[PDB]
């Protein structure tokens, strides 16, 4: 894989924290990460590599993969995206 | 579980052992 495909995957794992898929290998475009031309294979196998680290939660359904944040995934992302902890994601917006 | 052991094994080779364990469970000790 190239490195620029992976870097837009962690950004929607911080503010919301979840990432779904399709389990379609030959699917040429992942439709949620449009305008980047990343295949479904290159987000699905990347999250398979991330599940052996222990940073995404595995839950399957009829067809779609599902991947949640881990509680240790916030600290691993806040340095990899080089973010300050002063900004708050959707965890503590309401009430 | 001595009750379930007794009800399963009362006919088998281990019938006297599960009988003794059931009686141990029932009559105190």
């Amino acid at each position: 894989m190239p490195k620029k495909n992976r870097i837009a995957i962690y950004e929607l794992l911080f503010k919301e924290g979840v990432m779904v898929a399709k389990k379609d290998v030959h699917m040429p475009k992942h439709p949620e990460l449009a305008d980047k031309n990343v295949p479904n294979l290159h987000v699905m196998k990347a999250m398979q590599s991330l599940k052996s680290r222990g940073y995404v939660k595995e839950q399957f359904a009829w067809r779609h993969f599902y991947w949640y944040l881990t509680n240790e995934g916030i600290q691993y992302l806040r340095d990899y995206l080089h973010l300050p902890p002063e900004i708050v994601p959707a965890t503590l917006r309401r009430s | 579980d001595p009750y379930e052991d007794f009800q399963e094994n009362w006919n088998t080779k281990h019938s006297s052992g599960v009988t003794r364990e059931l009686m141990r469970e029932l009559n105190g000790g």
């Binding site: 924290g17 979840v18 779904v20 359904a61 009829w62 599902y66 965890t91 | 379930e4």
Partner: protein
């Protein structure tokens, strides 16, 4: 143009089937009972039923926030049009899903089949049901498969009252050496709705009121008022 009413009404079904399947698979530990999808063109809210509803939310409303974004980015409809509502169940003892996952907790918790099934049976019959049945099948002891029924109370097997007076649940437990599958049925009681049991009675249950003793007359009393 939109889709036809034939294809619309079925597509409302495959939505609630995949949603309920994914919800069972994820929330099979916190006692998931069922969804209620109230559709509205403004916000299609999804009401989650659960046993311990405060533990579904996470830390001050944290865990269900993940599921909101999951169901948002999954089914194509945009954000701000769905509201999750983790609601406490009415009675856990009168839900077949809530009991057939509790028996999985005790079987995978290393307990005897007799005491587990009879404890869940005791809890269901003390919860107010007219009767229930728990069947645990598989390699219970050895490597020839047995079954084990635990009948208690009344049960219906035939005719249209089996559609709303019972509720069945089939759960597979995964042990070390195979799969046991449990089947739990509960025959729900009466109470024209107290939100428990059907309103309709059993269709062969005739109930006859007692007559009140009218005061017998002796003389023709012509009482003006």
């Amino acid at each position: 143009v939109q889709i036809s009413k034939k294809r619309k009404f079925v597509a409302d079904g495959i939505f609630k089937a995949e949603l309920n399947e994914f919800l069972t698979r994820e929330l099979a530990e916190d006692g998931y009972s069922g969804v209620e999808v109230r559709v509205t063109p403004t916000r299609t809210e999804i009401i989650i039923l659960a046993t311990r509803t405060q533990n579904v939310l996470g830390e001050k409303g944290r865990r269900i926030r993940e599921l909101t974004a999951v169901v948002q980015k999954r089914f194509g409809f945009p954000e701000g049009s769905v509201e999750l509502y983790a609601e406490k169940v009415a009675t856990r003892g009168l839900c077949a899903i809530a009991q057939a996952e509790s028996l999985r907790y005790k079987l995978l918790g290393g307990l005897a089949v007799r005491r587990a099934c009879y404890g869940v049976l005791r809890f269901i019959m003390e919860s107010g049901a007219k009767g229930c049945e728990v069947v645990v099948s598989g390699k219970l002891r050895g490597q020839r498969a047995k079954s084990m029924k635990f009948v208690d109370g009344l049960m219906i097997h035939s005719g249209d009252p089996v559609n709303y007076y019972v509720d069945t649940a089939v759960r597979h437990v995964l042990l070390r050496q195979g799969v046991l599958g449990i089947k739990v049925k509960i025959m729900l009681p009466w109470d024209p709705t107290g939100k428990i049991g059907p309103k309709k009675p059993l269709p062969d249950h005739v109930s006859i009121v007692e007559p009140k003793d009218e005061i017998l007359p002796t003389t023709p009393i012509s009482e003006q008022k």
